[PDB]
Design a protein around this ligand. Structure first.
Ligand SMILES: Cc1ncc(COP(=O)(O)O)c(CN[C@@H](CO)C(=O)O)c1O
Ligand SMILES: Cc1ncc(COP(=O)(O)O)c(CN[C@@H](CO)C(=O)O)c1O
Ligand SMILES: [Cl-]
Ligand SMILES: [Cl-]
Ligand SMILES: [Cl-]
Lengths: 391, 391
């Protein structure tokens, strides 16, 4: 039913007005025909009545309805980008004196928001290994207000045992706000809110947009946390432009077909790489043997196309150029989740430096691949040519 | 390698300037820094130097390069929609006293262009059965200038034997302009120019855009016909806006994954319908027994999602409402090639009225389906519920 839901989510007649897709309603000013209409709009300004562009237009309402349906939430807040969704969703729930507990595999700018912004405002941050499971109850403190998950982890792809983590957290601090950056799953391959997580955050920038040409963040909350998220994000003025909301709705429609091809192609690549003499490790959650693969097999309904692997060596600056500069199909860039295949290198010491209170367990250069929609045999030929350049 | 080509076609740095996709260059005025720059631009105004917005900006040049690569042509003209591409491509090659030979299964607005616009301008049109094959030779007159193909045919979906038609035309009138409306194949399931056709026309509106929210026509010509196409369409002011050009290039990137799903689901539905006791006949190019199926299998590399079937009876007006008005997932609308599934009905005499000099061979009500990206079992249940309403 997912593919049918993707095609139809948010597409009601009040938003589409006769077309297949929602109209694009560009607005700051939204006009009240009468004082009664203005009173009604004011009362319902956070409940889907047209009131002011910072609250949304029809185009936003359609995307929000669609995200709430797909992720099973009570509300969806929208942000200029994925990093803004993370920073402002955390900020919405903390005050001077609180404590945040975050996986040490979190996206680096999410860590930096904690250590460079929150700290100067009286909020502290501790760290945990992605595979801590139930032992996380040990780290929970009497002022721990937020617990921040990200699964798979950034770059290294380790999957949480979320059931064990949530259960442990609910024993010790039931009213803690559990959050997850659910971007790798595109919010649909892992139903975060069905696991007891309070808020699922996405860089819709990635698979939801799907084409590397829009930036937008989303946060879908359960009924318990929606109103605080919505009103505190709004006090920071957080919103997205109507056209980008439209393009996010539009990306949903092909998300199923795309993800199935990303899953298929990338698992094939990773199977070939795990057999490869020049490869030390392969970190693909759908690959038997990867850190947390068993949780992935159990808790996820599929895979996307982003993973990583470790070379037999820490490439020099000169080897890195010979390797990366001369691919024919993979491109060097940040971001991911689009139609084209990407390649990025992180040296083991660089990873270690973004793993607070941990070290790394590999010494080769770590290559992160986004596997796009190209023919997978073409892409293997490109990686093979890459290996020949550094042998 | 098609999937790799779809991902990469037209995406060169002079257009993308560092992003994944081409920039969107919106312009009428294009600035000449010097008289010499203006002279150079004038000389190359049809060859991809910036000259004037009506000739195109970087965004158009990128799409044009993509289409020439994917369809194997020398140039690609752009139009406001498919119907404009058809009308203006035919018009570009005719003059008073010329004769056009068009398949009697052509899209109805294409026929009306011939009978209502060309006729009063001194250009006659004759008609042929789509399975005529080599016998088209006998219809070629001394003044026949254009032979217009459409395979599969509109609504009824008959597939031409293009090799036999092209060989027969080239025996009698080697210099005739052979055109095809290649929309059903999205220009990539049937490589028209490789079969000796001179110009491949598409409503990029359909599968190239892919989301039912842009209109655009394209015409890719071989080297023999390109300059005449280019300059006579320009004399009629035909262009597309830069944003829709961008959206067409963008659609190309997912065309492969989308078409494979349309193929799989539409063939499933067609095979199910062919077994159904309320179905007299299924018109799907990929279904055994359909008209021209053998040519589809030999000459195409796949199928899209549009096809039709004939019911075992002629629906009354009351039955038509009962059937059509109460679908849950199929929607009634014109166009096709999007993510959502569509349904339309025609009575046999309506089709007969748009089959010039021919009758139809069925008497039941005809249903045209577009199979979108929804789960095919959901779509089958929607069709079954419809059959129950008219049984
Ligand atoms: C898991 C994850 N979460 C957030 C973000 C940031 O989203 P933006 O919309 O880019 O602000 C990312 C993005 N990471 C990309 C590019 O920043 C990367 O290459 O690491 C993300 O992966
Ligand atoms: C085969 C074929 N060729 C051209 C067109 C016209 O394209 P536009 O971009 O709509 O001008 C079509 C479109 N016919 C659709 C939409 O009316 C239909 O419902 O039959 C076409 O099929
Ligand atoms: Cl109130
Ligand atoms: Cl307000
Ligand atoms: Cl000119």
């Amino acid at each position: 039913h997912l593919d049918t839901a993707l095609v139809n989510a948010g597409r009601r007649k009040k938003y589409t007005q006769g077309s297949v897709n929602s109209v694009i309603q560009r607005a700051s000013s939204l006009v009240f025909d009468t004082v009664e209409a203005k009173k009604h709009a004011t009362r319902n300004r956070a409940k889907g009545e047209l009131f002011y562009g910072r609250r949304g237009t029809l185009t936003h309402f359609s995307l929000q309805e669609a995200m709430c349906e797909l992720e099973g939430g009570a509300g969806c807040a929208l942000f200029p980008c994925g990093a803004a969704a993370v920073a402002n969703t955390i900020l919405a729930f903390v005050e001077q004196g609180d404590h945040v507990l975050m996986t040490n595999t979190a996206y680096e700018p999410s860590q930096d928001f904690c250590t460079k912004i929150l700290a100067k405002l009286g909020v502290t941050t501790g760290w945990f290994d992605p595979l801590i499971g139930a032992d996380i109850a040990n780290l929970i403190q009497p002022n721990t207000k937020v617990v921040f998950l990200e699964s798979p982890g950034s770059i290294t792809m380790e999957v949480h045992d979320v059931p064990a983590i949530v259960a442990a957290v609910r024993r010790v601090a039931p009213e803690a706000i559990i959050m997850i950056d659910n971007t790798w799953a595109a919010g649909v391959l892992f139903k975060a809110l069905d696991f007891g997580i309070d808020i699922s955050i996405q860089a819709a920038t990635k698979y939801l947009i799907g084409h590397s040409d829009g930036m937008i963040g989303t946060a879908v909350a359960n009924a318990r946390c929606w109103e605080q998220l919505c009103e505190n994000a709004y006090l920071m003025g957080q919103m997205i432009d109507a056209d980008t909301a439209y393009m996010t709705s539009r990306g949903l429609r092909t998300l199923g077909v795309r993800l199935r091809q990303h899953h298929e192609s990338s698992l094939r690549v990773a199977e070939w790489l795990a057999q490869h003499p020049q490869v030390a490790r392969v970190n693909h959650p759908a690959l038997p043997g990867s850190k947390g693969h068993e949780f992935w097999k159990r808790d996820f309904s599929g895979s996307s196309g982003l993973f990583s692997f470790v070379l037999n060596k820490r490439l020099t600056d000169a080897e890195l150029a010979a390797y990366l500069d001369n691919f024919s199909l993979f491109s060097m860039a940040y971001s991911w989740g689009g139609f084209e295949s990407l390649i990025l290198a992180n040296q083991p010491e660089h990873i270690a430096a973004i793993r607070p209170e941990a070290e790394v367990d590999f010494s080769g250069t770590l290559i992160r691949l986004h596997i796009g929609l190209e023919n997978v045999d073409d892409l293997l030929a490109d990686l093979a040519a890459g290996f020949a350049r550094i042998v």
